[PDB]
A paper describes a structure:
The [name]-catalysed forward reaction occurs at an important transition point in glycolysis between the enzymatic steps that consume and generate ATP. HsGAPDH was purified from the supernatant of [name] cells treated with the mannosidase inhibitors kifunensine and kept for 4 days at 37°C after transfection with a DNA plasmid for recombinant expression of an endoplasmic reticulum glycoprotein. A fraction of the molecules shows Cys-S-sulfonic acid instead of Cys in the active site. [name] allostery is mediated by intra-dimer contacts (the active site of one dimer subunit is in close proximity to residues in the neighbouring subunit).
HsGAPDH structure determined to date (1.52 Å). The crystallisation conditions do not nominally contain redox active ingredients but crystal forms A,B grow at pH 8.5, while forms C,D grow at pH 6.5.
Author numbering:
A (entry chain C), B (entry chain A), D (entry chain E): 2 to 335
C (entry chain H): 3 to 335
Amino acid sequence: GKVKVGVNGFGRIGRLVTRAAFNSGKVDIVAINDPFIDLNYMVYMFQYDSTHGKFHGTVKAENGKLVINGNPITIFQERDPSKIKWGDAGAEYVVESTGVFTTMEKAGAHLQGGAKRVIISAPSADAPMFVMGVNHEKYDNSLKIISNASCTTNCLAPLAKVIHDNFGIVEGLMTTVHAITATQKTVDGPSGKLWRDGRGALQNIIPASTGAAKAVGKVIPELNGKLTGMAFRVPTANVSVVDLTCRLEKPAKYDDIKKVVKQASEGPLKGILGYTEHQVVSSDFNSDTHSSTFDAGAGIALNDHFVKLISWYDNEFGYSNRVVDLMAHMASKE
Amino acid sequence: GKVKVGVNGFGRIGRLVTRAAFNSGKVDIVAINDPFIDLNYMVYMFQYDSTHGKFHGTVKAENGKLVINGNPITIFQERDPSKIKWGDAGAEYVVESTGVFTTMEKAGAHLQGGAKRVIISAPSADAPMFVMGVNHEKYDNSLKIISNASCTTNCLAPLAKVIHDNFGIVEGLMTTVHAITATQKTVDGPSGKLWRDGRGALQNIIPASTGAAKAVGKVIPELNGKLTGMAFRVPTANVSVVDLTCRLEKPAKYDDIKKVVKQASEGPLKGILGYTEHQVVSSDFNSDTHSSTFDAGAGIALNDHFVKLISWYDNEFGYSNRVVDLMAHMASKE
Amino acid sequence: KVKVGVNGFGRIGRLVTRAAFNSGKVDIVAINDPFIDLNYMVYMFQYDSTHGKFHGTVKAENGKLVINGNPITIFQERDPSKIKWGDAGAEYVVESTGVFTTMEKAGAHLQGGAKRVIISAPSADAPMFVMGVNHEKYDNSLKIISNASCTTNCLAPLAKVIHDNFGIVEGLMTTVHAITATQKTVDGPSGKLWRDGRGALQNIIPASTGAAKAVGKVIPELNGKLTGMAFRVPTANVSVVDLTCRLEKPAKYDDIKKVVKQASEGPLKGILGYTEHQVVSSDFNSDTHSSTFDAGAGIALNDHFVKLISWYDNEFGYSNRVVDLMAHMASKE
Amino acid sequence: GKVKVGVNGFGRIGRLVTRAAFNSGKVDIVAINDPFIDLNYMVYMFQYDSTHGKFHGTVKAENGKLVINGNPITIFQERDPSKIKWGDAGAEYVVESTGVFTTMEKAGAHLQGGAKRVIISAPSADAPMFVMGVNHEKYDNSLKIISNASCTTNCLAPLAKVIHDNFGIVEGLMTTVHAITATQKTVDGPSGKLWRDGRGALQNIIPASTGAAKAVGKVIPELNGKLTGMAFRVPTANVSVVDLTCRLEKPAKYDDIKKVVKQASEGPLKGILGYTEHQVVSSDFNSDTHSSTFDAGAGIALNDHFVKLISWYDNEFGYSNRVVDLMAHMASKE
């Protein structure tokens, strides 16, 4: 009944998509490929997690397989994705989570080994991009290689959809205050392509470029060219926040914005877009599976046409659960 | 001789204004009041600083006085500011740095003990407010009680002045990503008036309200009612950044904004407004005495009339040096 | 079963309340805190940066704090002798403010109708207990007792097993401790303990602690044989003890592992844990053990001189031991 | 200040040895090899430092050379250390700072390119190991490949020397509470050989093995087999502390220990072993060039034969200055 899934890469996204699949029970993980992490080490990395705690259940290495809650998973150690025998392991969909095979040409290598569909758990320069709750109904059975966009695009797009649908976004500029990530360094070190990103992550607020706001214009075509932004990386291990400053076409009193976001969080976007009026801080969203949670108290309006809206996101758990939800949606359309 | 100064409070601002006074030599500190920090403890707190390093000169306790670089300072321990005998110590100007006597009525208590003028090192609901380089020439000898605004207003106002003078700010919304402060808590604790501020400072990104952007409209009267904003407190010990999203009246290409800001930093705002095109991060501004440093590479434009401008500020050292600069300017007008 | 009142809604008071609402060992019926009003108590109990959102419901209703539908009377008294514990029905009181730790000061709660007081901190003169080590020495004549500190509850179960099997001739302890509420975010005033005022995020801070000396009161045979100190480091929770000790009988490191594992699997089950996994501090977040021996982290110089490592969630282990001590006291009435 | 030096690796040790060489003027850096960091990036990494601040001087790229304070430095980009043309660049001594060529066989590759002597800025399994102030007089001109031990061994050995010389160490066990390092990860990531070291550095206290205490037994042969220990990595960017628990041969009152350590710090170990009775914390040692600073107030004695001694070390700046001091000592004996 559940679609069988293969995961390429056991980095942060790969492990948390695997954890979301077992926690939610929406899909069945049957294979994992990682050429640099051996089976005994995969048991340790999956079982203990500094951010989300110990896995609830059992994890062990048995007969060359990773056995999670009694379910044996085939382990591959291939550097070339076209050589992974996904079909022999029974993996129908493959989550491409390494971050280095994000074009349709590179991600398509998984079809050579027998996968039926590939979900890139990152932005893609050319694959169709989806955000659950915003454009997932535009998915169709002819699309064999798709992208789930980024964690930041999944936070901004549901909020931008509600605001644009009700008031019309003339233009917007976004800032994301983002938790540290695996690409950063503990102390000042080499990052040849992005010099600021090499600076010590524990000591600094680091400005960074991000295509997340521009990507919202691809998922919501009416907002193409109307949004852009940037990021600041700060020394917190997890949970990030979006700050969208936008100009509205129709007048919107701040209480009217709260009303429409609250009603959207209770209907078609339930579990995707959250809403709170509580005095929350980032740790209150630790392991929260929403893509975006509107913080009513934190935002501020200058006038009825110019406002700053705040939305929280667990950049690890929200996104990993959306990858699983996208695959469950795809399976329902077969 | 140089103006003789009394400092009320030996907290973070009081100690760093004392440090800036002795390092710049622009004024002479002759008295310090603090009811909770005794003399031997003041020596220790002034000598060692986790953020700015050990004091460059000498500091010791001798015959009941705090002696800095051979200069003896009378120490008072009064809870009620109207009882501090400033005149008996020779203090002419008093820096009111406790944060709890910020109205002209409360700060005016220092005139009862013999002070001639009082400088509130914080925003005031009613005192005239100044930002060096923006409106300090509006100071006159009839003003006995004034405010130096906040560190954040001193960062935003010089940048907003240059942008408004050249292109005209129709409206703007600001976010400041701010380093932790003394009012925050190490672990979740009580903060009855501001619940989010009680949450653990090391673990969280904390939204906070700030009147800094609205205060720029008092310092630059043409911007009254055209700016507002909010803050996020993040776990860094020092150095903060302003993110101003504004709508411009005249078209401004991003290279034209860079040209205008660079010219201001090299001329009338030299030492107040800095400019950089380097790949900087927050630690690069540790102990930097500018009020604001425009980060050309970090900002982003959506179009010629809607842009996001970034400016760094050492929230401790920039502001403490501006308090001394303001007092030196006031003394020159006597 | 026993009805309890909590004095103070700081970190220990809230987490003792949270632990009490994880089982039915005790029932919280009253809370006193003159500085935190009812609506703020709802917020502070509901959201916790370290241990996550409370799993149940929490709301203010008719002037009472209602947790999982169970109402609690709220008092706002600065003087402990004035709290009306008896009128609320509180038989035992957890004295968690940290400022009424002598038997004279903690005894003020008996004036309001409480039968027994449990000081959730070390006391200069009250009998001190550590569950699993000397709780069987508790007697119905003791109306005011102390549950020692989180650090003493980590060291004492391990020191008991080591001393029982090999004999501790002498020991020196270091605890690498997570930040606490008494610390400061940036360099600020701490008149009595100057190093503790220095910015907690920026520094490793040495600190004095009577925890190792207190083990000698809990285990009388170790009186005068242990002392130590602490380093506060910038982590929000979870701490570790490092006990360097000289043993009377020779003990190979595998023999130490065997006796600690045996104690964890039987008589000290749920109090002293044992692991051979490649653990780090976050692996003990919200772990309710008092002490978890880290077999891989320790090191022996020889059969008589070793360094033993044990982890403790300084918030959750201790708060659960306060509740366990009260359940034990109730079984003895 | 006359031996010409080549530096292999421009990681944190390589950059800080280069900074110490120009700050002290004791040696002349003439060449640097790093195959992954190009010239323009070396300028940036050397100029800005999150921990120690901006370089005091000038640094530019000119005609393919890195020019520091007007001194041109030849830049090599060789992966194979036997192919670096040290002799052609005039480099007489080579600092091997990559951490991957620490045996005499591997470090000996620099002799193929014309270097006369090699100093491994890390522990070596077989090279002679030195600690300035403890055994540097045992260096002789027949030793072409030597090691300067580790930052932790340089902290413990000067203190252990004074304690052993005066009271005799029967046995000792050390714990070092260590700042984070470049080998750690920002979030839980792969560290196949040392699993605990892959866990998120910002979130955890991490136990780690270290041969530093055992290495003191090689630098002070009388202590061979009498010391061992372990480490805890904690989330601070720099500055570490040693905690030595030792049993003494002769009785020693804690005041006698303070007296002999203070005397050593004022005489033969001046600049190597420091001494303080102040209420210090780790940030008070930021950029401190001592190898070890005894903290009199932090330690504790159980009795006259069993004590815990505490000593601070700036793990970056102390050690980098000792590498330069060792090379200036070797140059003086040529």
